[PDB]
């Protein structure tokens, strides 16, 4: 058995970060590390693609770890080129047999760290639109993901108890859209954003264009 | 999270057996089940091949399970044809997303049950041979695996404290060979077999042919 930490990392400015591997067993273990970029993150059409550890936009090294009893080891993460907009990868960690059974359990635990490759000058920015049913839609026009916690739909430009508060703990990635599922005739919206990496940036009011 | 039991099953006489799935989480889970036959089991050249669940020599059903909070479910195992000699499969159980993320951990635990497809009239039988260096070699001439716990190498036909006892907890599958790594000039060997499925069958003496 083994463990990884942290379980997610932000990389920025070409600064390298570690995801570490902690031995949790009396045996020595052999861990393989491989990486997938996430296409269309946070959406319906999300999928993962295999990328080599040493030639992509994210350098992950080493790709094999020999993990002695009680030891800790590190995998280093480095942006190769800094992206204009945030990109996400999952780095997988998988124990294998050394390259070189009725009685006991077979168990294969594979851990993944979610890795965010961030742009250098971060810009959270959201746009509002309406559907076939006005059914208001949020569009990420910025260069990083927007973690939306709740949205306040108001009939006025003032936040208050009249507004209906729907909780949406959804991350919206750059150039992606979110279906709020609300087609009613509000005038303004207030997006409540999750806080990431020392950003505070609490309140966003966007005017909902009339239908 | 979820759990499986038992972790290994013997199937015999066309009698169906269960490997069960136990929900260990507050969420509902979707489990996929797929099967691999093990080629050259217990040896250097061991590898696994994908087999369909419903057309091989081992029928595994269902291949998808919807696992509600706190529930238990079953996968049924049935030999389609009974083999002349033991064959082994691994049945894998893997939670997936329903067919129809910085903050929280990504963890993919895949469990496997080792499944032995056994012949109807079981016959444990071993043969002895010598190497380039006499280096005595055990050959499984029977129709089931031989679980060898220890071997007593004697210079006489009598078991006793003169004999050197080497512990070998190795399963030797039918038509396969084991390298004892002992080239010294003994006369007899006594194989200590593990006990499987109500077999007792404790002591096997094979005469070591002179070099």
Residue numbers in the entry:
A (entry chain A), B (entry chain A): 1 to 100, 110 to 220
Task: Show passages lifted from the paper.
The CFA/I pilus is the archetypal colonization factor for enterotoxigenic Escherichia coli, a major cause of life-threatening, dehydrating diarrhea in young children of low-income countries and in travelers to these regions. The three essential components of this pathway are one or more pilin subunits capable of polymerization, a periplasmic chaperone that catalyzes proper folding of the pilin subunits and shuttles them to the outer membrane for assembly, and an outer membrane usher that orchestrates ordered tip-to-base polymerization. Upon export of a nascent pilin subunit into the periplasm, a β-strand in the N-terminal domain of the chaperone fills a hydrophobic cleft in the pilin to provide the missing G strand in an otherwise incomplete Ig-like pilin subunit, a mechanism called donor-strand complementation (DSC). In this work, the crystal structure was determined for the CfaA chaperone of CFA/I pili, which represents the first atomic resolution chaperone structure for the Class 5 pilus family.
The full-length CfaA chaperone (residues 1–218) was expressed with a C-terminal hexahistidine tag and recovered from the periplasmic fraction post-cleavage of its 19-residue signal peptide. CfaA crystals diffracted X-rays well, revealing the symmetry of space group C2. The N- (1–129) and C-terminal (130–218) domains form two lobes angled at 121 degrees, as measured along the longest inertial vectors for the two domains, with a deep interlobe cleft. Each domain is represented by a seven-stranded β-barrel with a typical immunoglobulin (Ig) fold. Although there is one CfaA molecule present in a crystallographic asymmetric unit, application of the crystallographic two-fold symmetry generates a dimer that is self-capped by two adjoining G1 strands, presenting a continuous β-sheet between the two subunits. Importantly, the Class 5 chaperones also possess several structural features that are absent in both the FGL and FGS chaperones. They contain an insertion (D1′ insertion) that includes the D1′ β-strand and is rich in acidic residues (E45, E46, E48, D50 and D55), which form several pairs of salt bridges with contiguous basic residues (K36, R90 and R185). All Class 5 chaperones contain a long, very hydrophilic insertion in the C2–D2′ loop (K164 to N171, C2–D2′ insertion) that is stabilized by a unique disulfide bond (C163–C172). Structure superposition between PapD and CfaA suggested that the function of the N-terminal conserved arginine in FGL and FGS chaperones may be replaced by R154 in CfaA, which is only conserved in Class 5 chaperones and is stabilized by residue E86 via a salt bridge (∼2.7 Å). Given these multiple distinctions, we propose that the Class 5 chaperones be placed into a separate family distinct from the FGL or FGS chaperones.
